[PDB]
Symmetry: C2
Subunit: 94 residues, 2 copies
């Protein structure tokens, strides 16, 4: 099962959002009716689901230091790529 599909499922069940409406181009923020509280629930679910920790503070720092754009963290297809990166690192550690 692809990382994105796993993410879509998590989001759909975490915020009761119709799975069919979630695409790789959707956003984990300001979209799908996802409010701030909803997003924190998504980040929580993703962390436990993949055994990782979305480093929100670190990401915010990069977007401010001009080292990243919001799209690379919140666009679902890219969020999946961020998760794969965090998984690879956590895997090595394990």
């Amino acid at each position: 099962t692809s990382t994105f599909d796993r993410v879509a499922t998590i989001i759909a069940e975490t915020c009761d959002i119709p799975r069919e409406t979630i695409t790789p181009e959707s956003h984990a923020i300001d979209d799908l009716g996802i409010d701030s509280l909803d997003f924190l629930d998504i980040a929580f679910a993703i962390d436990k689901a993949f055994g990782i920790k979305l480093p929100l503070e670190k990401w915010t720092q990069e977007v401010n230091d001009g080292k990243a754009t919001t799209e690379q963290y919140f666009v679902l297809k890219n969020l999946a790529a961020r998760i794969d990166e965090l998984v690879a690192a956590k895997g090595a550690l394990e």
Copy 2:
């Protein structure tokens, strides 16, 4: 300077929000025109400002486990109380 006042200043300057409109009863979320991206900037600024880390994942877990309400984390007066608690702990460690 009170913890709340410090928080109000941070929020005002982080999201360019008129300080006069920030009260102890305001919310760090779904209020003051604060969107999800704005909130993450606020959490970031608070962490560095007080030398602490707002444990967002842990809080989300408590609100889900029925061990806490959103009000005790996002209502500014209460957020200030959460910060004072995190500071006390960090202080002891230091």
